Structures are given as C-alpha cells and as structure tokens.
Design an enzyme around this catalytic site. Structure first.
Site, short mmCIF file in Angstrom:
data_model
loop_
_atom_site.label_atom_id
_atom_site.label_comp_id
_atom_site.label_asym_id
_atom_site.label_seq_id
_atom_site.Cartn_x
_atom_site.Cartn_y
_atom_site.Cartn_z
N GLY B 266 0.83 -1.18 0.00
CA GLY B 266 0.00 0.00 0.00
C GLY B 266 0.87 1.24 0.00
O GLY B 266 1.83 1.35 -0.77
N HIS B 267 0.56 2.17 0.88
CA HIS B 267 1.28 3.43 0.93
C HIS B 267 2.74 3.27 1.37
O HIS B 267 3.65 3.74 0.68
CB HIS B 267 0.55 4.42 1.84
CG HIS B 267 1.11 5.81 1.80
ND1 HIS B 267 1.01 6.62 0.69
CD2 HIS B 267 1.75 6.55 2.75
CE1 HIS B 267 1.60 7.78 0.94
NE2 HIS B 267 2.05 7.76 2.18
#
Ligand code: CL
Ligand code: MG
Lengths: 283, 287
Positions: B266-267
């Site tokens: 993800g991030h």
C-alpha cells in the site's frame, strides 16, 4: 474523567458565567449515552433546540440566548461524541444513530414539535433530522453548516490538523474568524482545553454513512419543513455563494442569504443581526 | 524554540530506541542552515557515491531500517529529517513555501559537499523530491519517488478524516489499521515512536497553511519540465488516492519515467515489501 477532562469541565462551567440569563444544566438519558442540556427561558414557552458548532459546545450561545430565550423555552443540547459534556455510548457513527439520539432527546424533554437552530456540525445534524423526523420540526435555521451543501475545502483540514500544535488554536481561530477580535477570552480558554483533552471517548471510525456528509440533489429536494440558510461572506470552509446556489437549486422554498461582515461563526460575529433574523423567520 | 517538554523528551527516547533497529553503523549529526538545524543519519562507505533519503510524514528517518543495510552497502547514504516535520530537526523561521523547502535542501547538499546525488523519497519526502528535482535538476542524478504525498493527484478526503483522529484514544491504531490494510508490518518499537511523536504537541509551530507550500499537485507543464530519470513506485492497496490513476497521470507527462504499481503493498511500500523495493530501486540507480 481524566485530569484534562476535569480541567475541560472546569473551563465549560466558567464559560457559563458569560450566559446573560438564568439557565439550568442537566443530563438526559438516551440510547446513545447521557446527554448534557442547558435550559433557558420560560417553562411554558414554545420550545427551541440549539445545536452548536464542532468543538465549541453549547456554551457558545451566550451572545444569542438573551434574545432567543425571552420568547422560547430553549434547550442547548451538547452533541453526542463531540468535545463537550455529553457522554457517548454504543455510537456506531451512522446518520441513523445520530437521528435516533436526537429523537431520544426530544422525547425525554417532552417536545412534540420544535423550532431548531444549528451552526456548523449542529447545522448538519439539523438537516439530517428534519429530513428523517419532519413531523418533529416546526422550522429550522441552518447557519454555516458543516458540509451539507458542499464538501469541505482542503484548507479546513490543513488548519484543523494543526489545532494540536503550539499556536494551533490561535492559528485556527485567526483563519476562521478572519483575524477579528470576536471571541471572549474565557470561551477561548474552554475551546483550547477541549483541544487539549484527547484521552476521552473514542471517535467512531470514518464512515461514508455518517458525518460529515454532503446531501445528494434528491435528498435536498425531499426537505419538507421550512428552512432558513444563513452563510457569511467571509466563510472559509467552502464558498458561501456556491453553497447558497446549490441550496437554492434543490431545497424547496428555502429562505437564504449570505451575510456581509460575517464568516463561519456568524452567530458570534453579528449577534444583533442574526438574533433578529432568526426570530423574524420563526414568527 | 522552547526547552524540550516531557513529551519531547519521551519522543527523543523513542527515536533513539528505534535507531537500535538500524542494522549498520551510523552517525547522527546536525547541519546548520538559514532554516534551522537539520538532523541527518549517515551510513555506508565514506568515499562511496551519495544517496539522500527523505521520509514520509510523522515517521522520521528511523523508518528506513528495513532498507538501509542494502542501500548503504553501496552508497554513502544521508537520511535527512525534513525540517519542520515531527522528528529530530529543529526548525527556525520556516516559511513553508515550495521555494524555501528547495533552498533548505540545497543548503544541506552544499554543507554535505554533494555535487549530484541519487535521491529516494516516500510520501512527504517524495513530494520534496519531485519539488527539488524540478527546481534543481543539476543537483540530482536520478530519483526514486515512492507513494508521494499528492504530487500527481490530490488527497482523498479519508486521509484527512483518519489523520484528524490521530490525537484521540486509539487514534494511531485506527490510522495505521486503515493505511496498512490491517496488517502487522511495522516493528512495535517504531510504532511506539510514531505514537510518541503524535503525543508531542508542544514543540515547534507549523508553518501556516499556504497554497504556495505543501501538499501540492504539479501541473501538466510542471510534470513535463522534468529533466532527470525518475522511478515512481506505488502500492496496489494505496489509500490516499487511486494508484492506477496516479500512475497513468505520471506516465502521460513525466518524460522517460519508469513507473509501476507494486503487488501486496500500500502506501508505506518500503516497509511492506523491502526485499522487492530495495532491489528495484538499486536496479534503477545502477544502470
Ligand atoms: Cl421579512
Ligand atoms: Mg536502468
């Protein structure tokens, strides 16, 4: 209650010293927790419910209550879960929960139909309620509502995120109040103590089905109770004229205006004007 | 510039414990600038070519613990605490303008004696990297931009809604559970520091919000002005914006960009898939 919470409660009580009429503070039970209410005005007078702006509490109504409570039995209700004296319980965070909470408040206060005034978050709760429980509302005054017609401009989030930093409250308020010397120092002390109080009850998780919320065109079209929309020309959380335009486009038979020399907290910036305007509408 | 509070002392304690995770020899020092005293952690061979790392928001330079052994085996690596963010750097009169942030990093380069350097930035550090490379191309060899804050797309409002909850009971676990897809990837010691920083609210003031500051989305023409080789990595489970839309936009406008959306990340992709991210960035810089 933690020590910061005890200190916040103290500041709240000192803020009531600014209240220019006699009032009574008490708790009402609801399905979603004990709810704090400040009552003012004649016991037999028609009812009026005040729902405050986010983080400000029911104490913010000091510049308006003398005029409003002369004619109405006024109840300033602390919004469940916000920074104030209400104690939330089992709140999932849906718009339905919040509507049911306020219904419990009306029910426990003996209110059949009532006039309502909401600012910021209270404005959003007011729109939600009148759409869901229209038979409980005579008419509603919505003042600078939180979202409702437009999404928050990202500036709001940038300033709100800096609240909990050295000089964050001063910075936040200066931006929101357009650098005007408006708020009484005692009330500011309360606002800051609320911001400092961060170990209280948990927030419901962000939820598309909760608040803040922008109503759809069809939801706005479905409003069935008369509404007065007041916005300030110096509003910072969204463009006020654009919000008025969207409100006017869909809310049937709305009364609405953008007030010169006021921004978001227009009830504290221009009380004389706002006090008469809302009363004129309720009459 | 206030004396360090009790929460500040606690944060400094956690920052130090988190540095225990650093698997290589390092040094902590400060660089004096027009803008304040900048904290830097240096690792790697002293004569090796330079690499500058810019962390994401609120995480500090300690976040590079899963990448530094690989990166500093090859480069003299400088992990720079972004001036004004929650970390060991001490800001003084930071305007918060994009021009001033670029001038601050130029002074760091100058003080470190850097001519050109490779650069890696994640989130906020990725936005500083894009800003710096567009303004000062002659000081950057190539740049790895990882999950940058805005830059290509504006933030989705949920970022702000979760961020505003950080300073609440259970606010950090809620924030992290959201951004990290309910996975347990961060070392508990690193999380203790992240939380200690959130709680440290009486240090420096923040620059006032500013349309000429960060966060920011670069224009098409700005993106087209890029004149150094860039690697953009994004995570399939990114939450601050749509990673595919961000990739499409970058590819459409940045000349010769290498861009990909990484699986099972993800991030904070550098801590979620370090093995993959470490080789991919090294591959990009190597040839
Ligand atoms: Cl009239
Ligand atoms: Mg290559």
């Amino acid at each position: 209650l933690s020590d910061n919470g005890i200190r916040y409660y103290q500041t709240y009580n000192e803020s009531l010293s600014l209240w220019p009429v006699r009032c009574k503070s008490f708790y009402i039970s609801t399905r979603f927790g004990q709810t704090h209410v400040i009552a003012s005005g004649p016991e037999d007078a028609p009812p009026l419910v005040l729902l405050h702006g986010a983080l400000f509490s029911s104490t913010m109504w000091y510049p308006n209550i003398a005029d409003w409570s002369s004619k109405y039995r006024t109840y300033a209700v602390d919004i469940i879960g916000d920074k104030n004296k209400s104690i939330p319980e089992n709140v999932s965070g849906t718009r339905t929960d919040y509507a049911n909470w306020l219904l419990d408040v009306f029910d426990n206060l003996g209110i059949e139909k009532s006039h309502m005034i909401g600012l910021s978050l209270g404005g959003l709760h007011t729109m939600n309620f009148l759409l869901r429980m229209p038979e409980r509302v005579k008419s509603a005054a919505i003042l600078s509502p939180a979202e409702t017609f437009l999404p928050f401009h990202h500036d709001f989030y940038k300033y709100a995120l800096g609240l909990t930093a050295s000089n964050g409250v001063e910075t936040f308020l200066n931006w929101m109040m357009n650098d005007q010397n408006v708020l009484h120092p005692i009330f500011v002390k309360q606002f800051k103590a609320g911001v400092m109080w961060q170990d209280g009850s948990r927030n419901p998780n962000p939820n598309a089905d909760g608040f803040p919320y922008v109503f759809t065109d069809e939801e706005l079209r479905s409003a069935r109770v008369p509404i007065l929309l007041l916005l300030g020309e110096h509003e910072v959380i969204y463009d006020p004229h654009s919000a008025l335009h969207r409100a006017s486009s869909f809310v049937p038979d709305i009364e609405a205006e953008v007030i010169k020399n006021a921004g978001h907290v227009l009830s504290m910036e221009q009380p004389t004007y706002v006090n008469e305007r809302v009363m004129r509408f309720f009459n």
